[PDB]
RNA sequence: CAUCAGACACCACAAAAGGUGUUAGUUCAUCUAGACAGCCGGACGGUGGCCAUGGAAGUCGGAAUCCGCUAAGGAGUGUGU
């Protein structure tokens, strides 16, 4: 008998989250969060996947469960 | 032998002792006349620390610095008739209020004679304590006799 | 006059550090003005008691790393209702005056500091 | 200003264990079991270890962070009510008519019965909630004691008892006669 | 005969209140604003007046 | 957040005055030189100061509005007599 607080486990933004860009000129690519600006905008870069370094909103992109 | 301690107070010559000293085996009317032998100089309002050893009235005199500053002042009044305030401003005593106030049991935590001589010399609100000035603003100018009493 | 009083506090604390060599940190808590006034009257000869803001003592020792860094071992011992006693008598007589005199039914000495080291006394 | 994260730390002592499914919070310990439904408040529980539970609110406004702090207060109060338990002492106020307070069983419903209040004839009756027992004080005159687990249950029965003895159509500062919460302590005698 | 250890607690619950100036709301004695929405949560308060 | 929501010119109305309801901003002071709030203690001595003396010691009432120890404590913020 212990503390059974269950999970409520999300995927967090951080420096180094890899993201799936789903709207725009990229529209389905990978990138990585470089430097996090505020509650809604982030700064992403996708160098091998091709998308140039740019700021984006967190509505245009979805977080993937992988990190580095 | 027991210990009884009372604090008698301001009276002119023989000026409610019965309610305070009935349980210490002492008198009521004879105790009022027993305090006349101390506060009779000393005709200014002061206190008397009475120490009754359970069979007699033995009153002592408490050393009061404000009453000693009033002892360097004018005593003129008799009883109940001066019709305004029964107060009188008087002589300065620039050095007599510095030896007597520094000898009244050295109260207030003084580390100098200019400390006690200003604590009991700048508290003048009935006397002038100067020939051409006033008290309570001379504490920063009284710098004499500090090494003599200490 | 808050800045000038704090500058006065820094100045007098740097003054009383570099003049004395015997420190008694005392764990005095809820002490009365009847006890303290008879401490001010008694210690007129050798010791200087200094109470006051022990978390202002924190910054005072923060700023005093350049001169005499051997006072670095005191900020873990400023915790609790403590004060300072500055004297030149090393162990015995000051500890006999502070602890034994004026007890009723909190005047102890919790740290003794002599020239860099700490002593249980 | 939309705080990015706010947190509180709930300290869980030894003899009790929490059990949180999504917001249904049960706390079990040496006096019994307590449950509370926090689904209306949207806060996030995170076990850091057996003794410490961090709660957190991300991206919340001002009312949301206030809700977080009162979530901490409620969980701590359940944990205190299951470790120690709560105990309110109420002492009467009566000028001329001694208030006669009993506990009677009317079909198993356990009513506190207030009689003779300011010379009234209305037999005032108060329900007792669940969990709270009610004792009468030894060797302290005219006192009643409510002891139980929940803060809300004990305190609410105390307040519902107090407000059955209000005074209508009088000067409420002259006729002070009533039943009043005196002391708010714990069941454990040491604490 | 109230035995004023008992009367002090009653005055805590009946006398020691503050009263709103606009809606007469019986407020807790150290409040800064009236809790009601109908007087616009005002700051005009007063002590509840004691006995004589 | 509205137990009187608001909603697009003319056009079919609302004001002075308020809110520790919420969001920003200006200025000053404290400010990180551990403040503020809370809890635990002090909250002195001259001094029942001078007094009107049944009695007034901060406290029916009047004017002076001081000094020493201070880390701090007022010729006192009311209550009590």
Curated annotation (Swiss-Prot), chain A:
Keyword terms: Acetylation, Cytoplasm, Ribonucleoprotein, Ribosomal protein
Compartment(s) of residence: Cytoplasm
Family membership noted in the UniProt record: Belongs to the eukaryotic ribosomal protein eL14 family.
Cellular compartments per GO CC: cytosol; cytosolic large ribosomal subunit; nucleolus
Function statement: Component of the ribosome, a large ribonucleoprotein complex responsible for the synthesis of proteins in the cell. The small ribosomal subunit (SSU) binds messenger RNAs (mRNAs) and translates the encoded message by selecting cognate aminoacyl-transfer RNA (tRNA) molecules. The large subunit (LSU) contains the ribosomal catalytic site termed the peptidyl transferase center (PTC), which catalyzes the formation of peptide bonds, thereby polymerizing the amino acids delivered by tRNAs into a polypeptide chain.
GO biological process, one term: maturation of LSU-rRNA
Record bears the keyword rRNA processing: no
Gene this protein is translated from: RPL14A
Subunit organization: Component of the large ribosomal subunit (LSU). Mature yeast ribosomes consist of a small (40S) and a large (60S) subunit. The 40S small subunit contains 1 molecule of ribosomal RNA (18S rRNA) and 33 different proteins (encoded by 57 genes). The large 60S subunit contains 3 rRNA molecules (25S, 5.8S and 5S rRNA) and 46 different proteins (encoded by 81 genes).
Keyword Nucleotide-binding listed: no
UniProt main location, coarse: cytoplasm
One function term, GO molecular function aspect: structural constituent of ribosome
Additional facts recorded: Present with 45300 molecules/cell in log phase SD medium.
Modification after translation: N-terminally acetylated by acetyltransferase NatA.
Signal peptide range: none
Swiss-Prot record, chain B:
Cross-link (Glycyl lysine isopeptide (Lys-Gly) (interchain with G-Cter in ubiquitin)): 117, 133
GO biological process: cytoplasmic translation; ribosomal large subunit assembly; translation
Pfam hit, one: Ribosomal_L11_N
UniProt keyword Ubl conjugation present: yes
Underlying gene: RPL12A
Note: Present with 68500 molecules/cell in log phase SD medium. There are 2 genes for uL11 in yeast.
Main location: cytoplasm
Subcellular compartments: Cytoplasm
Family: Belongs to the universal ribosomal protein uL11 family.
GO molecular function term, any single one: large ribosomal subunit rRNA binding
Coiled-coil intervals: none
Protein name: Large ribosomal subunit protein uL11A
Native organism: Saccharomyces cerevisiae (strain ATCC 204508 / S288c)
Lineage: Eukaryota, Fungi, Dikarya, Ascomycota, Saccharomycotina
Swiss-Prot record, chain D:
Keyword set includes Acetylation: no
Compartment(s) where it occurs, according to its Swiss-Prot or TrEMBL record: Cytoplasm
Annotated Pfam families: Ribosomal_L6
Entry's Gene Ontology cellular component terms: cytosol; cytosolic large ribosomal subunit
Keywords: Cytoplasm, Ribonucleoprotein, Ribosomal protein
GO molecular function: rRNA binding; structural constituent of ribosome
One GO BP: cytoplasmic translation
Record has Hydrolase as a keyword: no
Family in the record: Belongs to the universal ribosomal protein uL6 family.
Assembly and oligomerization: Component of the large ribosomal subunit (LSU). Mature yeast ribosomes consist of a small (40S) and a large (60S) subunit. The 40S small subunit contains 1 molecule of ribosomal RNA (18S rRNA) and 33 different proteins (encoded by 57 genes). The large 60S subunit contains 3 rRNA molecules (25S, 5.8S and 5S rRNA) and 46 different proteins (encoded by 81 genes). uL6 lines the binding pocket for eukaryotic elongation factor 2 (eEF2).
Functional summary from the UniProt entry: Component of the ribosome, a large ribonucleoprotein complex responsible for the synthesis of proteins in the cell. The small ribosomal subunit (SSU) binds messenger RNAs (mRNAs) and translates the encoded message by selecting cognate aminoacyl-transfer RNA (tRNA) molecules. The large subunit (LSU) contains the ribosomal catalytic site termed the peptidyl transferase center (PTC), which catalyzes the formation of peptide bonds, thereby polymerizing the amino acids delivered by tRNAs into a polypeptide chain.
Protein name from the UniProt record: Large ribosomal subunit protein uL6A
UniProtKB/Swiss-Prot annotation, chain E:
Cross-linked sites for Glycyl lysine isopeptide (Lys-Gly) (interchain with G-Cter in ubiquitin): 17
Domain of life: Eukaryota
Subcellular compartments: Cytoplasm
Transmembrane segments: none
Role played: Component of the ribosome, a large ribonucleoprotein complex responsible for the synthesis of proteins in the cell. The small ribosomal subunit (SSU) binds messenger RNAs (mRNAs) and translates the encoded message by selecting cognate aminoacyl-transfer RNA (tRNA) molecules. The large subunit (LSU) contains the ribosomal catalytic site termed the peptidyl transferase center (PTC), which catalyzes the formation of peptide bonds, thereby polymerizing the amino acids delivered by tRNAs into a polypeptide chain.
Subunit and partners: Component of the large ribosomal subunit (LSU). Mature yeast ribosomes consist of a small (40S) and a large (60S) subunit. The 40S small subunit contains 1 molecule of ribosomal RNA (18S rRNA) and 33 different proteins (encoded by 57 genes). The large 60S subunit contains 3 rRNA molecules (25S, 5.8S and 5S rRNA) and 46 different proteins (encoded by 81 genes).
Protein name stated in the entry: Large ribosomal subunit protein eL40A
From-to range in the entire protein, with total length: 77 to 128 of 128
């Amino acid at each position: 008998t212990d503390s059974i607080v269950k999970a409520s486990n999300w995927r967090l933004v951080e420096v180094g989250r890899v993201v799936l860009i789903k709207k725009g000129q990229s529209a389905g690519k990978l990138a990585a969060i470089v430097e996090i600006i505020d509650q809604k905008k982030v700064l992403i870069d996708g160098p091998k996947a091709g998308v140039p370094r740019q700021a984006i909103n967190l509505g245009q992109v979805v977080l993937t469960p992988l990190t580095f | 032998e027991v210990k009884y301690l009372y604090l008698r107070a301001v009276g002119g010559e023989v000026g409610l002792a019965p309610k305070i000293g009935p349980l210490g085996l002492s008198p009521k009317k004879v105790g009022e006349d027993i305090a006349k032998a101390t506060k009779e100089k000393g005709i200014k309002v002061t206190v008397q620390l009475k120490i009754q050893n359970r069979q007699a009235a033995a009153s002592v005199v408490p050393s009061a610095s404000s009453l000693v500053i009033t002892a360097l002042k004018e005593p003129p009044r008799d009883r109940k008739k001066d019709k305004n305030v029964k107060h009188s401003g008087n002589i300065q005593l620039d050095e007599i209020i510095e030896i007597a106030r520094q000898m009244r049991d050295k109260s207030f935590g003084r580390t100098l004679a200019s400390v006690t001589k200003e604590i009991l010399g700048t508290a003048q609100s009935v006397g002038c304590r100067v020939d051409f000035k006033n008290p309570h603003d001379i504490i920063e100018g009284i710098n004499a006799g500090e090494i003599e009493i200490p | 006059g808050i800045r000038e009083k704090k500058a006065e506090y820094f100045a007098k604390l740097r003054e009383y550090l570099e003049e004395y060599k015997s420190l008694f940190v005392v764990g005095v808590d809820n002490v009365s003005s009847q006890q303290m006034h008879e401490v001010r009257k008694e210690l007129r000869g050798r010791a200087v008691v200094l109470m006051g803001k022990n978390t202002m003592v924190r910054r005072a020792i923060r700023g005093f790393l350049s001169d005499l860094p051997d006072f670095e071992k005191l900020l873990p011992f400023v915790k609790g209702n403590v004060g300072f006693v500055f004297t030149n008598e090393p162990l015995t007589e000051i500890k006999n005056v502070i602890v034994s005199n004026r007890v009723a039914a909190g005047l102890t000495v919790v740290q003794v500091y002599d020239n860099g080291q700490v002593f249980p006394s | 200003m939309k705080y990015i994260q706010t947190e509180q730390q709930i300290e869980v002592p030894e003899g009790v264990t929490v059990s949180i499914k999504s917001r249904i919070v049960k706390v079990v310990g040496p006096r019994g079991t307590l449950t509370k439904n926090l689904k209306h408040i949207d806060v996030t529980f995170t076990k850091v270890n057996n003794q410490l539970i961090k709660v957190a609110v991300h991206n919340g406004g001002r009312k949301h962070v206030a809700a977080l702090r009162t979530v901490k207060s409620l969980v701590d109060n359940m944990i205190t009510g299951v470790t120690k338990g709560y105990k309110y002492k109420m002492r009467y106020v009566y000028a001329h008519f001694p208030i006669n307070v009993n506990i009677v069983e009317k079909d198993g419903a356990k009513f506190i019965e207030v009689r003779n209040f300011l010379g009234d004839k209305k037999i005032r009756n108060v329900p007792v909630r669940d969990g709270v027992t009610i004792e009468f004080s030894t060797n302290v005159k005219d006192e009643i004691v409510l002891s139980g687990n929940s803060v809300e249950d004990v305190s609410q029965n105390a307040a519902d008892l107090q407000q059955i003895c209000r005074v209508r159509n009088k000067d409420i500062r002259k006729f002070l006669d009533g039943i009043y919460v005196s002391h708010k302590g714990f069941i454990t005698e040491d604490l | 005969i109230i035995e004023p250890s008992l009367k002090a607690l009653a005055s805590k619950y009946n006398c020691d209140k503050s009263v709103c100036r606009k809606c007469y709301a019986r407020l807790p004695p150290r409040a800064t604003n009236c809790r009601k929405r109908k007087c616009g949560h005002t700051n005009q308060l007063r002590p509840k007046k004691k006995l004589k």
